[PDB]
Symmetry: C3
Subunit: 455 residues, 3 copies
């Protein structure tokens, strides 16, 4: 067989697993070992987006699950524990395992129980692992996937940084960014119509202050998984190129590409060399996923500009939208204040401030000034002040035709933004009303609900 390096030698190794986006250190070993892997399934509520909760099912408390790193030819003793708070039984199928179900039948584990099985890691490569319990798609859709790396015997080449990024598609009963605890939606899942498509389990998991980091001149290796359950990722780095892309344990290595297709259940190792400073965006280039469903992550590169290579400015909210900022924590706070019944005007203002970026500022500008004759001002806008309800209708339903704002005629078109949720429109408009010498007051989500029900 392949990976024929003999029986385990040395002492048993207890594998140290890491949480995304980090990776365990290189195994740095020239002999096969017995490696004991202990992974615990935990079901728990986490934020899939700001103010939006979801009951995740996780390997090790995170989505994706703990990263496992071993060497080709190791004997792996795999222990799966199912936390007693779990409602469902769980198990594991590891790609790269030689044997039926990738471990599935022997790792079946009821809540409060533990299972174990052993396998030899014959196949070098990066591999998805995932739950394999009926109904399988639900378990995977709830977050039960991660990566296992089986290193070549000599190790991978040294790089400056290694990161762990995994795409998944998620199916909520509610629409994108609709607040509250969102149940899983089987109808959307069967139809392959996800409400969110995400890197590492949440909107903004890898953006803003949670971005990945490197410096100019450094090499970055990223272990990229696609947990699915359903989507194939047109995986792409904005403004950069991959030096190498290698799928699973494949002999083929592609070089110098920017866009690469990762199958559902697939994994790849990609290598990047940072050449100029700024934010490089990892996306699924099925564009509505990246820009309307959350499928964007950032590798932020620090260092000296090189104007001979690129003269332009850093990425901003025109492209990245409301994820250009460090975080959108004001939205979480406003949502929690609504639930508690303590929503203040300032809670709404700060939430709207976060949501205004990109969404409105692309045309109206970050300072509300617009562009005279082309985009009308929201700053000190007589048209806004004159009719707040008309403003709600404008956001939801658009506006066109000749209007007069602060003494100037506009004759253009603002598209409808009907996908904004009632709280989002309310908070945005409350921000605008309380900025730029506008009259203050507030708009409530209930106000917006009524305007949505009858244009």
């Amino acid at each position: 067989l392949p990976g024929d390096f003999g029986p385990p030698r040395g002492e048993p190794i207890h594998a140290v697993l890491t949480s995304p986006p980090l990776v365990p250190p290189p195994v740095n070993r020239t002999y096969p070992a017995k490696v004991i892997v202990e992974l615990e399934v935990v079901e728990k509520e986490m934020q899939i987006s700001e103010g939006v909760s979801y009951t995740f099912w996780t390997f090790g408390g995170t989505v994706p699950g703990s990263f496992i790193r071993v060497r080709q030819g190791d004997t792996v003793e795999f222990h799966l524990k199912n936390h007693p708070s779990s409602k469902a039984p769980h198990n594991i199928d590891l790609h790269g395992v030689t044997g039926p179900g990738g471990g599935a039948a022997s790792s079946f584990t009821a809540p409060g129980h533990e299972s174990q099985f052993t396998f030899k890691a014959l196949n070098e490569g990066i591999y998805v692992y995932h739950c394999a319990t009926a109904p399988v798609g639900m378990h995977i859709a709830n977050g039960m996937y991660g990566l296992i790396l089986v290193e070549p015997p000599e190790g991978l080449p040294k790089v400056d940084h290694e990161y762990y990024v995994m795409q998944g598609d998620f199916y909520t009963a509610g629409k994108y960014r609709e607040k509250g605890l969102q149940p899983f939606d089987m109808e959307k899942a069967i139809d392959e119509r996800p409400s969110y498509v995400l890197f590492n389990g949440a909107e903004g998991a890898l953006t803003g202050d949670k971005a990945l980091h490197a410096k100019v001149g450094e090499t970055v290796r990223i272990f990229v998984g696609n947990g699915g359950p359903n989507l194939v990722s047109s995986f792409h780095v904005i403004g950069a190129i991959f030096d190498q892309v290698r799928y699973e344990g494949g002999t083929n290595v592609q070089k110098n590409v920017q866009t690469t297709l990762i199958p559902a259940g697939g994994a790849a190792v990609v290598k990047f060399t940072a050449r100029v400073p700024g934010s490089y965006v990892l996306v699924d280039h099925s564009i509505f996923r990246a820009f309307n469903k959350g499928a964007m992550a950032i590798l932020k590169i620090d260092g000296a500009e090189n104007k001979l290579v690129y003269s332009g400015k850093e990425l901003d909210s025109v492209y990245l939208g409301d994820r250009a900022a460090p975080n959108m924590s004001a939205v979480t706070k406003a949502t929690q204040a609504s639930v508690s019944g303590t929503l203040t005007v300032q809670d709404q203002v700060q939430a709207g401030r976060a949501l205004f970026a990109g969404t409105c500022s692309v045309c109206h500008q970050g300072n509300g000034a617009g562009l005279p004759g082309v985009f009308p001002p929201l700053a000190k806008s007589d048209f806004l002040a004159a009719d707040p309800k008309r403003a709600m209708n404008i956001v939801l339903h658009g506006l066109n035709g000749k209007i007069k704002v602060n003494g100037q005629e506009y004759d253009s078109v603002m598209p409808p933004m009907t996908q904004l949720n009632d709280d989002e429109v309310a908070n945005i408009l409350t921000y605008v009303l309380n900025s730029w010498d506008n009259p203050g007051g507030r708009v409530s989500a209930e106000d917006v609900k009524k305007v949505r029900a009858q244009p």
Copy 2:
């Protein structure tokens, strides 16, 4: 040109075609020949799933159609007959043919007619063929696709087994597993929302007693097609790796991968070496296809276990669900008994028995015992017996909160299983009621229809 080996020599060969999942023998020939291929289109009703009929349109009576095997440089005289019972005209486009439409204009054949055309097989490779008659998508969706292999002049390397597997997506008016003769649904097809995604034309075509077979140490070559019409397959083998994957006649060969993307209309040759015994599952790893729409096939490997490579057990119904068993023939029989108006309790029981596997047994166990305090028993369940209608509501709509069953408190969550059809819920519950010292009686599909209409 390529395949420039001269005019046909020897005698004309009448091609012997094979039905899936078998393949004709290697051509074992060192000279170009004239090869006469005769293929007949037949439209006919077959079972797409147990108790579910569909009007297939087929090349040679099967889906996929008869496998055609020739040598690069052969001159192929292709005869297409359209059976007189056909309602539609038909034709053929063979990928790998050099010429407009891949044969489409010259192979147009009305019902009861025959056509013929000739082409030189210049391009070595594995290729999809399919109908090319307006409306093309309908013809393909109804099953009109297969594979043609054009061998390299020296032949392919010898292997122990060769098999023929083709994915297709199907569009029925009714939902998945809704019984009866199901018409084609154009609205679902245009939207690329299939009701079934299948290997070789039917649910379970390649599972259970219809599994593919090999022995430990043997090599298996599988000719894999994706007839579409629409889907791209994240093609994957559970618990194994492909030694090689080669697309069509491509010069590139990938090695040591487990997951590979096959385009709509694409074909690949994959090679597997059996290392340990058990069931290896071929899936489309867009998981809801494999586990909710039928996209799973089995290669069952016989031989001695190797505990140093894999210590675990064979695949079971936890992962494979109700396809772990040899067949689900009881469902076909119960469905036919309903149509005839002769449905007995025992017909329902045996049908429910088949459907209970995986679907319910993952939590409640194959013996109905559950797990005390975690999953409540269905065996001798006082809670079940106390209210049969409540049991129908539980399957359809779920259950949560504190309950008492056989003197023990449970405080967990059973998800809804709303996608089960009325007959499936009726048969499952009838099985349960007539097992494990439960009180007997029956539930009817009409009972379930009423509970579905008002929770």
Copy 3:
């Protein structure tokens, strides 16, 4: 860095850009230059299909946008102008650019404004460029994408012809071929449910009299892009093979394949050698895209037939449907006559004539004769003449069972053709009624609207 060929030398070059499907000449240069690229965004209404208008947003007045061709190591000074008639601001992200956003932040351009930025072309390859303005998906869905080629320093190998083809998916409020100015539909876009999937911006952009051309024995290179926004293309040439397929600037080159997956936002260079005459169809082999949504383009090859390679006939309306003809201009004219209120019978007849090809002629024949006993005649049909309204119901809702037509019994099935729009059914039936000694008269779209509302 890569592309380290020194500072620009010689004189500044003003790039000459080309409109699809043409490509600028090879740069034919052995030194790095400064290349000044000037591109103007124009928003405008164009025909997405005959009688169907759409407001496209374009780079340079076309979809896809102007082709840009430079050499690896060039310094590119990129000027983006936004025409003053524009309603939206725009910018550009060029794949292959080294730097954040691929130019996005520095190329933000309000209506009536100009922006510029500079970059060094370090990466050789074919690359998509596209708008990068919030909401990004809308901008791209409206047509804002094209290709930039960065040649290797020695140039690409000489070929006889070079062409430029780009797929995109489009989202209209109305259904496929529903006439009028069609707004963009955000709901369909987010769900990845396009109404049209097109090469180069329109149905028939590259079919009939707008086909690409070459001669037997010549080599054709095609720069193929997938602008998306959302779909992955199972890109395929009917009846031919690609000698080479190279993605972006990748080191891997695949050879001798017919079907290849192009990611959303991906681009490839493919090479074809014409071997026999006829029409070769480029499609997205997700078949319902190619045959029901418009994703088909033609490379028409002139030259001597070779019966030893292919004995069959040229592609016709059986496969290609109504795109077999030179154009469908009669449909545009009938649609415009309806809007103006001047629709004549002959306008309808000529429009129906175009629409009858494939759609009806596959069974009923181009001369309406049918096939006695199998497909009934529309020529001098007593059954048609006897009840025009029944004919509308037949097209919309199908027909089966025993009928008598011109003294002969038929007992077959004509499927419903419910996806035909009211004007299409009206025009088809008006064509039939005014042909083949049928009684004349006309059917109106309003007639058909009433039959659709109640079968």
